[PDB]
Amino acid sequence: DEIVISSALRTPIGAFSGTLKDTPAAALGAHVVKTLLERTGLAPERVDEVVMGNVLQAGNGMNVARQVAVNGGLPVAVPAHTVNRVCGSGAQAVVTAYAQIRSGLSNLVIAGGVENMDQAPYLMPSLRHGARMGHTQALDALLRDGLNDAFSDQHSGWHTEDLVAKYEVSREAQDRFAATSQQRFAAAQAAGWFEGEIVPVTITGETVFAKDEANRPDTTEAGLAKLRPAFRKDGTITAGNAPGLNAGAAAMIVSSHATATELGLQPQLVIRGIGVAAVEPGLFGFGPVPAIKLALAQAQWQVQDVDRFEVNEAFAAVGLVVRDELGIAPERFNVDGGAIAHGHPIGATGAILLTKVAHALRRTSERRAVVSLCIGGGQGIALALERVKL
Amino acid sequence: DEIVISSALRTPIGAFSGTLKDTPAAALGAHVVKTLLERTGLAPERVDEVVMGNVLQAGNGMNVARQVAVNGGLPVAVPAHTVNRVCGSGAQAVVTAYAQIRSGLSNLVIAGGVENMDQAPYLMPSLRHGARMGHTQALDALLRDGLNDAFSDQHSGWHTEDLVAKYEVSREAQDRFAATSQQRFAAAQAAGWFEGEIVPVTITTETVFAKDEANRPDTTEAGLAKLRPAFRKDGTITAGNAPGLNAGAAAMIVSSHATATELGLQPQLVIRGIGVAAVEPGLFGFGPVPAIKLALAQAQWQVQDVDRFEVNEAFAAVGLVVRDELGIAPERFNVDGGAIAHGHPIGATGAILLTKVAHALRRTSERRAVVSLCIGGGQGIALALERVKLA
Amino acid sequence: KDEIVISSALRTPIGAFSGTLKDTPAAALGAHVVKTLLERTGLAPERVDEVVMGNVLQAGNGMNVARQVAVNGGLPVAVPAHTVNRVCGSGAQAVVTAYAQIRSGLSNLVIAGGVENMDQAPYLMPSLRHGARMGHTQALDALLRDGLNDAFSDQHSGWHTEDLVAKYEVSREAQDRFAATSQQRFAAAQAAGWFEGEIVPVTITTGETVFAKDEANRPDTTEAGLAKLRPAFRKDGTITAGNAPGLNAGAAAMIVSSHATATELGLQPQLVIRGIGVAAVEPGLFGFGPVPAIKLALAQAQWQVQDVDRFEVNEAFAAVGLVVRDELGIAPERFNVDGGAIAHGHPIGATGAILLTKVAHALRRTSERRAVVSLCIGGGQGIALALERVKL
Amino acid sequence: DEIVISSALRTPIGAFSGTLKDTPAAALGAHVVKTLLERTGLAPERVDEVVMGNVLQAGNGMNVARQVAVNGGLPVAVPAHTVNRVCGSGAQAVVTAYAQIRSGLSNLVIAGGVENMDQAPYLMPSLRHGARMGHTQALDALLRDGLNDAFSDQHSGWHTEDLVAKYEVSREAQDRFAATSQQRFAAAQAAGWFEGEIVPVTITGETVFAKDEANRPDTTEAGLAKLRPAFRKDGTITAGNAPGLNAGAAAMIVSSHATATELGLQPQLVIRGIGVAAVEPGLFGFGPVPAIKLALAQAQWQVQDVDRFEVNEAFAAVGLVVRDELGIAPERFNVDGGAIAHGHPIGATGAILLTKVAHALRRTSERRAVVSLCIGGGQGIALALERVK
Ligand SMILES: C=CC#CC#C/C=C/C[C@@H](O)[C@@H](O)CCCCC(=O)O
Ligand SMILES: C=CC#CC#C/C=C/C[C@@H](O)[C@@H](O)CCCCC(=O)O
Ligand SMILES: C=CC#CC#C/C=C/C[C@@H](O)[C@@H](O)CCCCC(=O)O
Ligand SMILES: C=CC#CC#C/C=C/C[C@@H](O)[C@@H](O)CCCCC(=O)O
Questions:
Q1: Which among B67, B288, C218, D136 could bridge D126 via Cys, Cβ 3.0 to 4.6 Å?
Q2: Are strands D3-10 and C370-377 parallel, antiparallel or unpaired?
Q3: Closest alpha carbon to C25 in C67, C54, C68
Q4: Ligand 4 shell residues, CB under 6 Å
Q5: Element (H, E) at D125
Q6: Helix, strand, coil proportions of chain A in percent (round to 5)?
Q7: CA of C247 to the centre of ligand 3 (A)
Q8: Is A155 a catalytic site residue?
């Protein structure tokens, strides 16, 4: 009755206005699901549900998860639903799957997340019943539904300056963390460490998109020191110590260990612990701390027991606060780099981080990992994960 | 370890361009949650999660469920997430809660759904990177993300004409079903049968909105026969045998029976069975049939054992196909009327139907009910529900 | 006999903002006036050399509003047409344009007027062609961007008029008195039937409604009620929704020709154009524009202010009426005698043609001999015509 | 009492999404007016009026002509108004000036036209009072207010296929006319023949925009034969035998000959005749024919007396129909190329064609020219023009 992750796969991550700008989030997910089914040879009839994270659902059409399922080639008999816990959404899909299997509602779920920030439409709140007289606003949905706090209407980056102030996170420390994320990601990418987990996407000439494109390998802390604050005049957060506005998808099979063995799957990770926590919306970057403590308590693990922490780099400041609050060794925190380098396709990111850890533990023979994401609105999600031997 | 529903409550349902047109879906949910907490006296710290259904999330701001939780007065320590299984979303929130409790992730969840179709914005897909030259479309989000099939871009009502054709559902039968829904709802409303489940909403313009406003009590099958088809030239589906574009919210506590007793709650329903099924998108109206069979199989019930079926009236045609395919007695199908009368606020409707059944079984002493909804894209959700006696 | 005359001046009633004409394009209002003008005059359509129409909010009205007015008005496709824009002066400019075409030998007979429908002005999306890229973007109300906001400052005409108020020491109390008097004079004139002769009713299909009476006026207006209103354009201002006109819709048109041409074709001339003035001033003091324009028109006519029976000066704001009246020393009883735009409305591009129409009919009724029509113009201009009644 | 054109000047013409895409039409006009005043040394107080053509007025702000005048450095005492006779607008501004001078309203007018088709906004007709339910359209103003017929809502190019059908204008003839326009324009441009009339524009790095950019010198009849019809499935009109969606401005001084001499101006052209005509909207391409006949009748000229015709290339098909109906020698029709090559910035084009002819007659010592434009909605405008020594 161990719940395991099998066949975790992801697209490469697109840059803002980059290679995936014309490819809907649901099409990215459908491509990963189609590929997962063809590579595993899993009988499509054994899929009980598709669960997908997606934050910017505006204009994506009815129920993104059902589009991912049907356009991914699954039989129309497979149900599907879409979950939204903001940046946690792609990890939430896997927690949702775990709950459905443990509760007896499902035996096997395809879970993941999708996002395409270019494909987020503009919103016209006054178009239905009229603006009447005077200028009116068209809202960028990626700000209104994705990155701005629902209570303040301030950017997540504006709020994170209060986390920076509270934990005395220097500009210099943020830029060092960001430069290190770029350097670690570039070295891992050059070593071929992401080839196994990436499903190339054909863009119609045809272009094969096979490599993460959002990263800047030549980044130095000295170069980052030159950038202007992006969110407050006297701020520390810049375009260089924050991730971009990215596109991508990831998906994986969630089942009991027995079900995976029965159907000839090769489990990658066992879910040993799950944590979901919430904090003040204004201090959302702290969310992973209580979430990780809950996941570690379920797994009966100490911080010192964990080979690697994979914590989303929503901002360098959030990575530093979570790492230092929990006393995690810098060499065991975002070992192969994070979202500052590869990008943060909101609803997909949690599924991407699970995918990275599945493949990294197999490569390194590391035994124990934690995946965690901070969540706009003041939440955190964490999974404690153990490598399954072949 | 029985999973029970306590303190199910709902707003009245707003008409399109009606009383709730300026009240965001998240504010409707927050109002229900705030009221549920004050009436139950439930310690807010005992709420482990808020799960809310919402289909038209466009322009509602970051994570509707978290807005419902925080604006409902729950501590910032209570996590929240939003689910979307289209018309099933408000029932899905309760299934999600059940799964979290049975799997040990949660002990007590506030679950429900919210929708406001007036508040759905228009979408401009070409505004980010430009239309360049030539006219461009601004899409109505309630069609693009709610009512149009994602595969065909045809209205759910257009697709339902193929269900009508396949099951030979006459225009006359659809209009009789619709007139009966209006008549049953009007009589139940006049008897005061919805007063207990409704939390009035104060609209500052202040006026108190306390009564469902979308229904048409004077409806007759003869009157409905005069209406033009809404979705196809040779169609049977009209504005009169389909629900409106409505607004509302509903929420309830989901917990083990033991947890409910421990915290001084009065359980209304025990969840005896859950069914989630999927079919051809083009025949989505059939979805409740396999879903109901799954829920009844988990409950070890036969159709004839059930006191009332509460099946969403997405169209009169869908109600008739589901009722007649399962051989349900017409007097036990949507007993107090359905969405044709009271409205279909998409993401809230499943939570509203659970709320109606919770209060109807208490009033009637009926023991066994099924709530089911068809789902755009070809799905169905069903819960088999048993009345819990007063302690 | 080579004197230039106005014949058969006619107008629609003026619609309120979000009122009876909200679904009727400006070009359709003009077409309706032209159709009626042709049937009442019996003018052979082939004798029309050109149609000139004022229109300020051209956005979304389709190619060349004047040509739509002409063709939809039932004129042969052989009749040329063009649209002029001198903002609030546009409807009077069309008549000056006609005068210049006739005096220069380009035309013998012109149908001139103006059209506007402020409800029908669309919103503009400047960022939709090439994209907003990231972050919120503005949809502009065209009636502000192209009609009422100054092109240099982007401030409302009403914001700028507060500087005219300061310079000419125009009290809030004086503005509210002027506004109350405009409402009272217009309501009395309307009730007496004094606008029935000049108005062409419009049938609106909804059932059908016959729109036959100006609807934008507020006869119950009091100085006490006006004193309670908040300043509309500056927090410590004097200009309010009550001492300014609305956002209105309407059309007017008339025949311009030599007196000899009018007689030849069996038309009944109403007015002789005795003088024309077009002037410009500081954009921020545009309300003063009529003063130099009126002086130019009076100089051409060889008239003194005291020779003029009535001044018809557009009430863009009560403040503008007061400045023009008091600067020229005009008797209050001879200034906007039958009320003005504060009461009946200001359908921008039509207003100048409406004021010429009002004066044509008022001089006939009263046997007054001499009038001046003048309008202030956003961007700092003024237009004026000195007009003499033609005897029958 | 001869009415003359002096100091005709223009910007280079921008391509669609090209160098002028961020520069408002009124700013292009202001730049030409500022340069005209510096070069002539004309006392700004001697300008009685500014008249500007502009067709896509949507979003340009209150009264484009007044913005051109004030931003061009004219005193606030100079009145200004904007005219719209669609593609004829830039020539109409000069006719308007002529009428104001002959009627005694004005002694000296700055007249011209401005257009920037990139800068034309999208329109939302349903945003004021609401779309209520169901998808709604955002209209491209350049189609709604500029290029689509107001009666049919069909593109001018769609209507011109009926002119093509009526006059049996072959695809091959249209592509030959278009290739010849490109070849003639490229050769004239390379010879420096447009340098005198062009006022360069600096766009902020900086771009110094000094040369027309919309033309395609490598155009061949063989290449044009490969293009798909743009307006009808079995049509003849393509992106290659029609002009683009362009930006530019032109302006000139209009006055009596005596006034020009008095103020030390150098007259370029005398207006000898003016024609304004109208036809069935769908066959608007024919409009120049009756308009040219009116202008020639006022000038007491025959077609054979005219050294060059400058007729707007709204479509190759329109140029061919006008040329062949009037029996004009192909070597005397759009001699230095036309809008297919250099572009058609709607409201400016008529003023641009007057500017081209002013400078071409000075260079060639040709005596007599006609400028004419077809006009959407079924109109035509023509001026008969004589070189001043
Ligand atoms: C749900 C928790 C969260 C979050 C987040 C985040 C951070 C996004 C970074 C962005 O705001 C900007 O830095 C992107 C700058 C865009 C630069 C560009 O134009 O591509
Ligand atoms: C997710 C499954 C589903 C569904 C559904 C549905 C039915 C919606 C009915 C409405 O589309 C129609 O009644 C149109 C409403 C007309 C009201 C109006 O025009 O104001
Ligand atoms: C060309 C020169 C000029 C001018 C002018 C003007 C009009 C000012 C009044 C308007 O701006 C506003 O008061 C209209 C108020 C609208 C309120 C409403 O109808 O809801
Ligand atoms: C007022 C009379 C007229 C006219 C006209 C015209 C012709 C317009 C040509 C354009 O429609 C064509 O260039 C098609 C536009 C191609 C757009 C592009 O460059 O992508």
A1: D136
A2: unpaired
A3: C68
A4: B 133; D 16, 86-87, 147, 156-157, 230, 239, 242-245, 314, 344, 374-376
A5: none
A6: 40, 25, 40
A7: 5
A8: no
